[PDB]
């Protein structure tokens, strides 16, 4: 046969990814996780982030991060 390219690993969630401007993610039920999502703001890709060590609304929205519910 073939060299399996169907994986299934441990998910057992509904951990799940929003398109938009950044890379961002959310999971709430077993796995408890979540990625950041667009920072303050940039022109290429880099320029201005949220310092979420002197700001602490950059880390509240960063754990808030979740993806649409329509």
Excluded: Y
């Amino acid at each position: 046969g073939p060299e399996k390219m169907e994986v299934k690993e441990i998910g057992r969630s509904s951990k799940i990814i929003l398109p938009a401007c950044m890379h961002e993610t959310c999971s709430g039920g077993f796995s408890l996780k979540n990625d950041c999502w667009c920072c303050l703001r940039l022109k290429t890709k880099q320029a201005r982030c949220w310092k979420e060590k002197e700001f602490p609304n950059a880390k509240e929205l960063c754990f808030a991060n979740c993806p649409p519910l329509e």
